[PDB]
Structure formats: C-alpha cells, structure tokens
Design a binder for this molecule. Sequence first.
Ligand SMILES: COCC(=O)Nc1nc(-c2ccccc2)cs1
Ligand SMILES: *[C@@H]1O[C@H](CO)[C@@H](O)[C@H](O)[C@H]1NC(C)=O
Length: 342
Amino acid sequence: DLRLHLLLNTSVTCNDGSPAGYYLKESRGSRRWLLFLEGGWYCFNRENCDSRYDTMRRLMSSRDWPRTRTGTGILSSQPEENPYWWNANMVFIPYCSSDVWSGASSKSEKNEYAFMGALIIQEVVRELLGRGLSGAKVLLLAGSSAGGTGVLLNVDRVAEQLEKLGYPAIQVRGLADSGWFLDNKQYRHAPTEAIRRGIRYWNGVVPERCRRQFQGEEWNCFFGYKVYPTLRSPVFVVQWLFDEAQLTVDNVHVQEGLRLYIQNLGRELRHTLKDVPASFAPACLSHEIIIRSHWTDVQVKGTSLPRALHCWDRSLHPLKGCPVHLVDSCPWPHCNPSCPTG
Ligand SMILES: COCC(=O)Nc1nc(-c2ccccc2)cs1
Ligand SMILES: *[C@@H]1O[C@H](CO)[C@@H](O)[C@H](O)[C@H]1NC(C)=O
C-alpha cells in the first residue's frame, strides 16, 4: 500500500477547490523515485465538466479519496510482479484536474473550476524533496493515457525545477504509456478542436521549445510526434500500434475500406516512432499497460517491457542482446502472439 498525503499548500487544488495530493510508499534503501500520473480523459467547457462532476467525481475532487492504494505493475514492490524497479520509492499522483496535466488556473469569481495539473505536479515534487527525494539519483516521471501525454508536457519542466532549486545531480527521465496520439482523419465524420478549446479554458501550458515553434497553435504540442522532438530529457515511449482510445476518437468500432484504414493507422504510428530510440510498440488492440498486473506478459521480438526498460537504464550509464527500440512490423491487430487476451 501507498499512503495518501494531501498537499500542505492548500492553494494547489483539484477541480472543485479541494486539496490535491499524492500516495507514497518509501524505500529508504533506494535512490530511485517513480512518480506516476493517473489518466482519465478530460473536459473542455462548463457543460461537459459539470457532467463529469456528477458521475466521475473522484477525477475532480479529493473529498472521497481513500487513504491507501495498492501498487500494481510498475508500482508494485514485489520482484515477481515488477522485475524492473521493485525496490524504488513509489508515488501515485491522482488525476483530479481534467486538463491532461496542463492547467495553471485557479477557481475564482469568473472560473467555476480550477485547472492546476501542471502546478499539482509542480508542488508534489517540492514536498517530496523534504521526504527523501533530495537524495535521489533518478526521478522517473511516468503516466498512462492522459497521464502519458502529461509526461510529455511536464518532464522538461520538472528537470528545470530541480536545477533552479539546486539539485543538479538528480537525473529526470520520462515514461509515456498510451499517450502518443495521431491527429489523423477519422473513419467516419474531432479531437484537435476539443484540445484547442480546452487550452483556452484551462490556461494550459506547453513546453517552451514546442511553444516557440508553433507560436494560437499550442494544441500541436499535445501530440507526441510533434512535441517529443523538442524535449531534452530522455523519454521512453510505450504505445500500442492499434490503441483503443485512438480508434474510439477515429469512430472505429471487416471489409476493404476499414481494413485499409486500420492498416494505414498502424503504418503511420510505426513511422512516427522510427527515430525514437527508446520505445516499445506491439501490434495489439489494447489501451494502457504499465500499472496493469500482467504487464510482464507482452513481448516484442522476444523482449518484454520490463526487460526493455532495464536495457534503457543500462544505456543511460548499443548493448548485446539487451535492446531498447522495439516496434512490431506486422500489420494487423494481434499478429503478435503475446498480445493481451483480456
Ligand atoms: C492529444 O490528446 C491528449 C489526450 O490525452 N487525449 C485522450 N483521449 C482520450 C479518449 C478520448 C475519447 C475516447 C476515449 C479516450 C483519453 S486521453
Ligand atoms: C502555494 O502554491 C501557489 C500556487 O502554486 C503559490 O502561488 C504559492 O507561492 C505557494 N505557497 C507556498 C507557501 O509555497
């Protein structure tokens, strides 16, 4: 179990003004720290945020949060569930800002909700330094789905924060799981407009180099293949080639037209990853993996995800039989036999 801590700075809040927080399990014999960003869609105006507050309130408030949480997958402390980082300090950061971890706006007389995702992170890091993060060797910022995109938007800001605060020895890295989306044409007739509206609603912030490239066009930086080239911190990318959330936004739920559509989607995703040296992309129909209990099962070219992440660690000290770039080439869902049956 990871135990809950509400933020001492109560001005950093969830959507409804309740305090944000984090769950922590601390491993005093380790100098590695894993900070995981929860996912769960987003909302982009008053009307659909109001709907989210009725039936998805734990994603908008801490008032009902439980006191402990079980670490699963990469957050597990058992070596046989987590071959990669079982002895690390574990942190789970709940997603209660509905802004893809990008907001920096408080609740006011003109704002019904607060969107503080970028600041919630910003602050979890601050309070953790007093609980042992000051002695870390590596800080891995991880996340799934909306949290995976949140890794891409925030990893360089965390690195900059620790540099100005006087901790140049902490190596900040990122692990983005199922947050590598394409702004492609739908199968039937959209995401990009929802993101554009969201940024204005949230006062959303994007990384500085990406902002300077696109200059009204900041929505571009929410898409993996466009923002990744601008990042300095090392980032490992985990992405199913046929992600279920990507197919949902494409209005896909088999004859020739749809066959070509699905094959072209895999090809395009595969193309966007070819210059990404640390990546794991199996040809499966699924969504999220790294905090799933059976995340050790899937393999690409005979290498599991826990092994590929270990090989990544070694590379940051090509390696013989310990690869870090693993992308399937076969063109149809579940042509990899190790894909989840679920
Ligand atoms: C660039 O976008 C950032 C992002 O996080 N987008 C997401 N989209 C979803 C989603 C949307 C519709 C149906 C199922 C899932 C989850 S997260
Ligand atoms: C609390 O957080 C807010 C928003 O991030 C910030 O303006 C303020 O300086 C913080 N207070 C303290 C005491 O750090």
